[PDB]
Design a protein around this ligand. Structure first.
Ligand SMILES: Cc1cc2nc3c(=O)[nH]c(=O)nc-3n(C[C@H](O)[C@H](O)[C@H](O)COP(=O)(O)OP(=O)(O)OC[C@H]3O[C@@H](n4cnc5c(N)ncnc54)[C@H](O)[C@@H]3O)c2cc1C
Ligand SMILES: Cc1cc2nc3c(=O)[nH]c(=O)nc-3n(C[C@H](O)[C@H](O)[C@H](O)COP(=O)(O)OP(=O)(O)OC[C@H]3O[C@@H](n4cnc5c(N)ncnc54)[C@H](O)[C@@H]3O)c2cc1C
Ligand SMILES: CC(=O)N1C[C@H]2CC[C@@H]1c1ccccc12
Ligand SMILES: [Br-]
Ligand SMILES: [Br-]
Ligand SMILES: [Br-]
Ligand SMILES: [Br-]
Lengths: 487, 489
């Protein structure tokens, strides 16, 4: 048995921020538990978390790789010549480079633990034995061999989320993003199921690395992908994915999957349509990872949707037990989990309570081309405010008239409270959008108005200067109803 | 044939002059004439309708830097698994130049159509000069003895003629070119010397480095010790290293003394030190000077500064009440968006009874070097002279993607400079892919008097380079009454 100020279950984005801050900033005794010391099968996530191992970090490297399909074609308009028939995309090389980068990160976290006073790592599966006891077992089975018993003044639940798999016949013949990161070969025909960012990002990755004759299809059960993003941008990215050879099947949903004699999969949709593919990747959602924690031993309350219930300071209903990150089933982003972890420790072990602000969080989609966004979309703003103005700019940049990718319209939209000019949301589609949006997140914390943007001098030539060139609304929402002019 | 009369006559149909003229005619109903010397880009006069940025400046050079970036993309693609016949790769400069020419000409034509269409906004072709306080003469050439095409009566006159490359008076200067000619070279030079340490020399060095034929070499020389004076010093040193790493030779503390022709017609450069260099093109990029000579300002007594620009007050007014000047002719910040801002502010003040002056502080700007620079506000050594305590927050590392691409020399640098007494951000300085796009919204932040805590409190977008700006909480070092030190005393 061992005694600690804080025990953290999950060595992920939020859990490591909390543990490192508690130990080094406040001199507390910290233990952190995770199920694997490095990335990949069998548990996929590991020391460092989902983002490091099977999330933001590797997917961004793979999207960067897929972008070269466009760069090689687009170079020709600027005078670059080479033998186009010799081009091939080596997926095995991509995966190996990615594996080496992730493993390097795994190892550096290992040395962080070895080098930091009061910060200890334990390998295994953590669960709640009692209000102040965390048990670590050999496997997820609550009857496997006990490896450690950790006495804890404070306990932090930070186990993340896991892919949601629908209850359809043949679901066992589908994969999730976890397995996609380790496919031995790039699939020639693949169906990505879902309208969210993971489905869209992997569609672009597979589209660039598919062997000759390949085809990527994305299906989504409703009418328009990327629910929760700006509607203009949802429509445009649909158009631009289609322009690069991806087939978008909206209003379609798999009803069953069966095995073909050649090893491929036969998908039947609810509509009766059918599609044969080599890989079916389900990306329909991620759900809080609560089942192995034995929350019933202590009575931690869950919400109806399955998250651990928390107040604004990450406190559960059980004193001294906290939860942060995807397990709270709110904003599933790595920088939000980190922010929550730091606020938690500042509150518990320092003399200044802090709560994370979940509004005006900038985020991105690394689609090809990508999205950057911060704040409210117009239809959400129109329910909170009597008068909303939308400023819009949408055009193909000069360089893509030369590159030949004339479909690559850049979209920039600013949403305001028209009563006082306050910027409520900014939404971008196009090369650079994730980088452009970061400092917009800072602007929204300075009560920036549309006139603050338009009165700033532009940097020229950039896509970003469009944000400082919009003076006149394109249209409005009054009492919730869209209209081109004010009454 | 009779003279024509206007509320406003603009000499120079460039970045500032077109903003002023369009706004005066379309926002305030005034009658406007605009004068320029050429209706589309290129020789003989290079700049033309649209101005220096459109014709031989920001717009074409950015297209050409984008073309040059593909040399890096093609090489870097192999780390991510892309395979192709490297021996087959060729950079066709003629196709680049033709694509750029068609793009610029399309802009020329659209501006020509704006004038043909817009009530109260007229274009006159020729050389404008001041005859009297209310008369602009348009002549066939810059020579004031050349024939008169029009006389334009004007209640208000706007001088917006821009600037021009400076050429040093050395023997053999006739064998050298400027950026104007660089935009029209029939073939890419095998060996080229770019002379100068400023952004134009650096940007063109990158362009020539990508399009040079097999076995070529780009050399950049600068007469002082470190290129890119005025930019963050960490970034000055890093850009130097990363240009060197891509095969550009940087000769600092060197300056051409004379140029002669070898018997084969190549240029033989002798430096002041006695070193020699043989090249096919010498491009001078040592500075740009305001274009005042042809305006005949003595006719009306408009005062120039010692430096040579038109003297103006904060509202762009010369010493002659109804004559104004904006843009590069004022020899201050030579940027297109500053000239545009000055022109809009002038017209709002004169014709819109809503007075406004341009803020020349905290202006965001970029260098499209490879990799590029984005900056806004004060460099730390300047801040240390004005503030008792200055803090510097700094992050510099090779991003993960360039550990796979192989370009491990591509360190991304992010620096924030503050007044440590109250946290106010005084300047932000960036080096790396995306930096010009990242810095734009930073300019809005500084206009809003952002403090370092406003940056740190903002949640990052992950994974990006930009999120480094929102994860810096502890100074790397300080300046205390001018003195650099790791810790406060
Ligand atoms: C494909 C993909 C792409 C993404 N891309 C982005 C992106 O670009 N940007 C972004 O901001 N977010 C992205 N995310 C989301 C991001 O990964 C999560 O928001 C973040 O990782 C959650 O942090 P966390 O601290 O809640 O948990 P995690 O980082 O998930 O860590 C939880 C850890 O708990 C461990 N664990 C689980 N159960 C137990 C147990 N019983 N005992 C011990 N250890 C346990 C797990 O092994 C894991 O390491 C992406 C996610 C995915 C799946
Ligand atoms: C190579 C290069 C790259 C650049 N890159 C950038 C960049 O990336 N970003 C940026 O912000 N700035 C850049 N600049 C600077 C930018 O081009 C200038 O700051 C801007 O064009 C100045 O605008 P203006 O209105 O002062 O004059 P201009 O735009 O220069 O317009 C002046 C016009 O006056 C005309 N003219 C001159 N004399 C007469 C006369 N007597 N009668 C009639 N017409 C006349 C000229 O033909 C010209 O069209 C660059 C400049 C160069 C040279
Ligand atoms: C003024 C300018 O930019 N020039 C560039 C080059 C060609 C024309 C002119 C010039 C004069 C003297 C020597 C070399 C040159
Ligand atoms: Br779906
Ligand atoms: Br929908
Ligand atoms: Br060529
Ligand atoms: Br702070």
């Amino acid at each position: 048995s061992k005694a600690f100020d804080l025990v953290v279950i999950g060595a992920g984005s939020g859990g490591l921020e909390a543990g490192w801050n508690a130990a080094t900033l406040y001199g507390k005794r910290v233990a952190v538990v995770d199920v694997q010391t490095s990335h990949g099968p069998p548990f996929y996530a590991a020391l460092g978390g989902t983002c490091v191992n099977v999330g933001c970090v590797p997917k961004k490297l793979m999207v960067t790789g897929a972008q070269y399909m466009d760069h090689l074609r687009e170079s020709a308009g600027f005078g670059w010549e080479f033998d186009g028939s010799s081009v091939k995309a080596n997926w095995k090389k991509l995966i190996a480079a990615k594996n080496e980068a992730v493993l390097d990160i795994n190892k550096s976290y290992e040395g962080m633990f070895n080098d930091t006073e009061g910060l200890d790592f334990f390998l295994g599966w953590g669960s709640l034995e009692s209000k102040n006891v965390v048990v670590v077992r050999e496997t997820a089975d609550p009857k496997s061999a006990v490896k450690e018993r950790l006495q804890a003044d404070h306990i932090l639940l930070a186990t993340g989320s896991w892919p949601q798999m629908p209850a359809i016949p043949g679901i066992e013949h589908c994969i999730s993003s976890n397995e996609a990161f380790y496919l031995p070969e790039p699939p020639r025909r693949v169906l990505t199921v879902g309208g969210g960012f993971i489905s869209v990002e992997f569609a672009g990755i597979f589209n660039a690395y598919k062997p000759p004759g390949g085809k990527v299809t994305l299906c989504y059960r409703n009418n328009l992908i990327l629910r929760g993003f700006d509607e203009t941008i949802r429509e445009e990215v649909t158009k631009q994915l289609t322009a690069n050879g991806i087939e978008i099947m909206t209003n379609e949903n798999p009803a069953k999957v069966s095995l073909n004699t050649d090893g491929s999969k036969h998908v039947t949709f609810e509509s009766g349509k059918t599609l044969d593919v080599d890989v079916v990747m389900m990306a329909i959602g991620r759900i809080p990872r609560t089942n192995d924690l034995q929350l019933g031993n202590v009575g931690v309350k869950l919400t109806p949707k399955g998250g651990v219930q928390v107040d604004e300071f990450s406190r559960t209903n059980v004193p001294n037990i906290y939860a942060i990150g995807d397990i709270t089933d709110r904003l599933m982003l790595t920088p939000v989990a980190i922010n929550e972890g730091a606020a938690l420790v500042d509150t518990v072990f320092g003399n200044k309570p802090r709560k994370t602000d979940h509004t005006r969080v900038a985020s991105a989609v690394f689609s090809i081309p990508p999205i950057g966004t911060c704040g409210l979309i117009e239809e959400v703003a129109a329910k909170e405010f009597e008068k909303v103005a939308v400023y819009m700019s949408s055009f193909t940049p000069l360089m893509h008239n030369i590159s030949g990718s004339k479909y690559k319209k850049f979209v920039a939209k600013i949403v305001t409270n028209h009563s006082d000019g306050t910027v409520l949301g900014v939404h971008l589609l196009g090369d650079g959008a994730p980088e452009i949006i970061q400092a917009v997140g800072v602007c929204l914390r300075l009560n920036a108005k549309i006139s603050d943007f338009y009165n700033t001098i532009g940097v020229h030539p950039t896509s970003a200067e469009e944000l400082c060139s919009m003076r006149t609304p394109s249209y409005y929402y009054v009492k919730g109803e869209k209209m081109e002019k004010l009454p």
